[PDB]
UniProtKB/Swiss-Prot annotation:
This is Desmoplakin. The N-terminal region is required for localization to the desmosomal plaque and interacts with the N-terminal region of PKP1. Residues 1-407 are annotated as: Interaction with PKP1, JUP, PKP2. The gene is DSP. Belongs to the plakin or cytolinker family. It comes from Homo sapiens (Human). Spectrin 3a repeats lie at residues 199-269.
């Protein structure tokens, strides 16, 4: 104001168009919807190339004017608009880049997640070998991603540092990325645990079913390898007993192998209930492998949950430990021991070991008694064959000892015969009579000496 009226018009119209352009490019809303960002890039490109062309329309106008301030004021407004126009074209660019990148980076993690989410960890999946390696490949792919992600955030923080008009909105998008990333690592942490427990689960039954087959087929093997009849020669017996004692040593090495299975069973996890079709009368107890949270509903690593519905092989309806029903991803839930299928097997296998141990005890004392029987008969023949004339040739302690031998060999027999199945009462009397006879046949010759 205060100038020529033609100058007040030409200058007003200019400042009016130059500021109506600022209004339009400030009334743009900042969003991460790539479809919007795209139309804003084209939109502004039309406004930028418009004011860029306006420099010449402005030159013509400054040439007609003569008012000192007017000219300066117009040039100052234009140079200000032009500067803002450039910085806008750049702010849009920077945005599109950072979002496109983060957008594709989220889909990558999501796809990784979708994969592990749909994986089958039941007993039907025995390939803890394929999985083990495929996983190590991914853990490498991931250590690779963390790099790409780290510098993607370093690119983002820079934009916030430069007060990008959309700072808050991109930090929010990055928040999303961070959330997905943290979750994929949680899955990997509990995938390492499935791999371990599932390995054990299969290792255990492979070893147990193989031990059970052994101790059951050994209960019959032995009984055939060591027959016990009353008509076996003395030599053969002593040699059988020696082998029979090597056997016990071996079945003591089993006790240690067996005791190991007893222990493992107490730690073997449950897999069958992971299948939607598995039915049981006892409720299924779960444990959380990692924190999972979905809007105000949160489960903590180590929380005990109850399974309600598992028709979905990726999402289970789960309750507890605060009576709170919630859908938590199957991946992050395991079914801890005790596994009744494992404990019962370890109990069974243990009873086979004990059966063998008992069988051994029977065969042992059986032979030990058959040996005392023979040792007794040798002494009985010595005493029976004793004549008064034959005695005088021998020392007075050669025969005094032969009865001592018999007395002791007969005690050993009575002792081993107690729990033996080799001698019925018919024989326990038969020998009892041979002994008592020979006993007096001796004291008949003990009195005749003087």
């Amino acid at each position: 104001s205060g100038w020529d009226e033609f100058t007040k018009h030409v200058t007003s119209e200019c400042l009016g168009w130059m500021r109506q352009q600022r209004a339009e490019m400030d009334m743009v809303a900042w969003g991460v919807d790539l479809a919007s960002v795209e139309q804003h890039i084209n939109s502004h490109r039309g406004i930028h190339n418009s004011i860029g062309d306006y420099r010449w329309q402005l030159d013509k106008i400054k040439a007609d004017l003569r008012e000192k301030s007017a000219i300066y004021q117009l040039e100052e407004e234009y140079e200000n608009l032009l500067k803002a126009s450039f910085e806008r074209m750049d702010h849009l660019r920077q945005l599109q880049n950072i979002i496109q990148a983060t957008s594709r980076e989220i889909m990558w993690i999501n796809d990784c997640e979708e994969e592990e989410l749909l994986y089958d960890w039941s007993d039907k999946n025995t390939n803890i070998a394929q999985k083990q390696e495929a996983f190590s490949i991914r853990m490498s792919q991931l250590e690779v991603k963390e790099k790409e992600l780290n510098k993607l955030k370093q690119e983002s923080d820079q934009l916030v540092l430069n007060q990008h008009p959309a700072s808050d909105k991109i930090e929010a998008y990055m928040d999303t990325l961070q959330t997905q990333w943290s979750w994929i690592l949680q899955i990997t942490k509990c995938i390492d645990v499935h791999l371990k427990e599932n390995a054990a689960y299969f290792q255990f039954f492979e070893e147990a079913q193989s031990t059970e087959a052994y101790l059951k087929g050994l209960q019959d093997s032995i009984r055939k390898k060591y027959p016990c009849d009353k008509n076996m020669p003395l030599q053969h017996l002593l040699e059988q007993i020696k082998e029979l004692e090597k056997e016990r040593e071996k079945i003591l090495e089993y006790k240690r192998q067996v005791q190991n299975l007893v222990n493992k069973s107490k730690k073997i996890v449950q897999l069958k209930p992971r299948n939607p079709d598995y039915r049981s009368n006892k409720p299924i107890i779960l444990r959380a492998l990692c924190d999972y949270k979905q809007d105000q509903k949160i489960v903590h690593k180590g929380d005990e949950c109850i399974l309600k519905d598992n028709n979905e092989r990726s999402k289970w309806y789960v309750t507890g430990p605060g009576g709170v029903d919630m859908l938590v991803p199957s991946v992050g839930l395991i079914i801890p021991p005790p596994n009744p299928l494992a404990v019962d097997l370890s109990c069974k296998i243990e009873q086979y070991y004990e059966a063998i141990l008992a069988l051994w005890n029977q065969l042992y004392i059986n032979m030990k008694s058959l040996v005392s029987w023979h040792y007794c008969m040798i002494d009985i023949e010595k005493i029976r064959a004793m004549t008064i004339a034959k005695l005088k040739t021998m020392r007075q302690e050669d025969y005094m000892k032969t009865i001592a031998d018999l007395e002791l060999h007969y005690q050993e027999f009575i002792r081993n015969s107690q729990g033996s199945e080799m001698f019925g009462d018919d024989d326990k009397r038969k020998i009892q009579s041979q002994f008592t006879d020979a006993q007096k046949h001796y004291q008949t010759l003990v009195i005749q000496l003087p």
